[PDB]
Design an enzyme around this catalytic site. Structure first.
Site, PDB file in Angstrom:
ATOM      1  CG  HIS A   1      -1.805   0.286  -4.336  1.00 32.65           C
ATOM      2  ND1 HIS A   1      -2.445  -0.594  -5.183  1.00 32.65           N
ATOM      3  CD2 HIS A   1      -2.752   0.743  -3.483  1.00 32.65           C
ATOM      4  CE1 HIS A   1      -3.724  -0.680  -4.846  1.00 32.65           C
ATOM      5  NE2 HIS A   1      -3.932   0.121  -3.813  1.00 32.65           N
TER       6      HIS A   1
ATOM      7  CG  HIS B   1      -2.087  -1.014   0.965  1.00 32.02           C
ATOM      8  ND1 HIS B   1      -2.164  -2.183   1.690  1.00 32.02           N
ATOM      9  CD2 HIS B   1      -3.133  -1.032   0.107  1.00 32.02           C
ATOM     10  CE1 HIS B   1      -3.218  -2.873   1.295  1.00 32.02           C
ATOM     11  NE2 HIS B   1      -3.819  -2.197   0.332  1.00 32.02           N
TER      12      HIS B   1
ATOM     13  CD  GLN C   1      -3.605 -14.197  -5.363  1.00 33.03           C
ATOM     14  OE1 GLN C   1      -3.532 -13.417  -6.309  1.00 33.03           O
ATOM     15  NE2 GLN C   1      -4.093 -13.843  -4.173  1.00 33.03           N
TER      16      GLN C   1
ATOM     17  CG  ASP D   1      -8.168  -0.699  -4.234  1.00 30.92           C
ATOM     18  OD1 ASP D   1      -6.919  -0.572  -4.212  1.00 30.92           O
ATOM     19  OD2 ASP D   1      -8.852  -0.724  -3.202  1.00 30.92           O
TER      20      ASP D   1
ATOM     21  CG  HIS E   1      -7.148   4.296  -3.244  1.00 28.41           C
ATOM     22  ND1 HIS E   1      -6.045   4.347  -4.075  1.00 28.41           N
ATOM     23  CD2 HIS E   1      -7.257   3.012  -2.836  1.00 28.41           C
ATOM     24  CE1 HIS E   1      -5.512   3.140  -4.164  1.00 28.41           C
ATOM     25  NE2 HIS E   1      -6.237   2.310  -3.438  1.00 28.41           N
ATOM     26  CG  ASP E   2      -4.864   2.199  -0.204  1.00 26.89           C
ATOM     27  OD1 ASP E   2      -5.804   2.022   0.610  1.00 26.89           O
ATOM     28  OD2 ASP E   2      -4.645   1.416  -1.146  1.00 26.89           O
TER      29      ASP E   2
END
Ligand SMILES: COc1cn(-c2ccc(N3CCOC3=O)cc2F)nc(-c2ccnn2-c2ccccc2)c1=O
Ligand SMILES: [Mg+2]
Ligand SMILES: [Zn+2]
Length: 315
Positions: free
Chosen positions: A75, A71, A272, A220, A109-110
């Site tokens: 990113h 993060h 995953q 995202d 956003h982060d």
């Protein structure tokens, strides 16, 4: 720092590649801030923001991403670039205010992410969870965004009407909150039902909000939509961060959930495959239904899913 940014020109060899959904910013670190300026200029025009304020703002944003494994500033720009590609491919759908807001929301956003989930902060009664009871980090991210805007010389929205200003701040707020994946499942389900019953209506602001929410999730998660060697390496960063959170719990003698347990790394490929089937595929599927030009994301997501299968099957 911001002064040299103002001078930046994106090399011509990247002018076409940058338009592709699967474009990987990875090889171009020194250019990331310049790439964001580039994307803003192509999408919102060069008249949209005072260049100097825009440059101060971007460099302050960069400064407020921490040195965590996933993060981080990389990113941020990756998510912003995906949003650029969505907007560029749906040129008639979004208002100028939406385009400005959403590019900024994605970059921000982060902000000041600590490398910890909401669940962790809540379990241990961190001050941030005492302040923001739900969507804990996401409210912090928006809070950090507002703090940067209010710095001297950073108000990129200064030349908006008072009313347009509150409008864009709300667009930004809803978009950042929408990146709390816990909220995604319900949002996607509502959207799917609205589609299948033909009641989805983009003149309706609450429908628009939901679509933007889904677009935010899609951007995202977009590491799952890159070429396999890129996606594979990014999975390493994601688990590095998951495992560091689990390590923090082990420091109190507490066994973490398996997703966060580095002793359970043999389960990653199956983890995953599960995640793609439960989360990523439905996300890009619904997105493509609403916005057909976003189809290359779903296609790339499917390709990576088949790669994880091969890993599981030892091919
Ligand atoms: C099992 O593998 C994975 C699991 N998760 C995951 C994460 C959170 C939640 N949360 C948080 C709150 O509510 C939830 O459900 C559930 C999840 F499944 N994300 C990714 C992934 C792929 C690309 N970006 N991200 C990512 C998204 C958010 C955070 C970290 C990584 C992934 O690869
Ligand atoms: Mg987040
Ligand atoms: Zn994110």
């Amino acid at each position: 720092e911001w002064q040299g940014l103002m001078q930046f020109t994106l090399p011509v060899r990247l002018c076409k590649e940058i338009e592709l959904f699967h474009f990987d910013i990875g090889p171009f670190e020194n250019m990331w801030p310049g790439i964001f300026v580039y994307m803003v200029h192509r999408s919102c025009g060069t008249s949209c923001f005072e260049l100097e304020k825009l440059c101060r703002f971007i460099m302050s944003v960069k400064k407020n991403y921490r040195r965590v494994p996933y993060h981080n500033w990389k990113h941020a720009v990756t998510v912003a670039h995906c949003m650029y590609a969505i907007l560029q491919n749906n040129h008639t759908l979004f208002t100028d205010l939406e385009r400005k807001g959403l590019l900024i929301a994605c970059l921000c956003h982060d902000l000041d992410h600590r490398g910890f989930s909401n669940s962790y902060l809540q379990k241990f009664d961190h001050p941030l969870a005492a302040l923001y009871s739900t969507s804990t980090m996401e409210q912090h991210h928006f809070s950090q965004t507002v703090s940067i805007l209010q710095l001297e010389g950073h108000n990129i929205f200064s030349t908006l009407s008072s009313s347009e200003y509150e409008q864009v701040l709300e667009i930004i707020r809803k978009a950042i909150i929408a990146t709390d994946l816990a909220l995604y499942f319900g949002n996607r389900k509502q959207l799917e039902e609205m589609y299948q019953t033909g009641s989805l209506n983009l003149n309706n602001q609450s429908h628009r909000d939901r679509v933007i929410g889904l677009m935010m999730t899609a951007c995202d998660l977009c590491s799952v939509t890159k070429l396999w060697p890129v996606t594979k390496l990014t999975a390493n960063d994601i688990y590095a961060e998951f495992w560091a959170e689990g390590d923090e719990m082990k420091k109190l003698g507490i066994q973490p959930i398996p997703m966060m347990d580095r002793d359970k790394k043999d389960e990653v490929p199956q983890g995953q495959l599960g995640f793609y089937n439960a989360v990523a595929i439905p996300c890009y599927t619904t997105l493509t239904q609403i916005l057909p030009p976003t189809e290359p994301l779903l296609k790339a997501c499917r390709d990576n899913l088949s790669q994880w299968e091969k890993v599981i099957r030892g091919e």
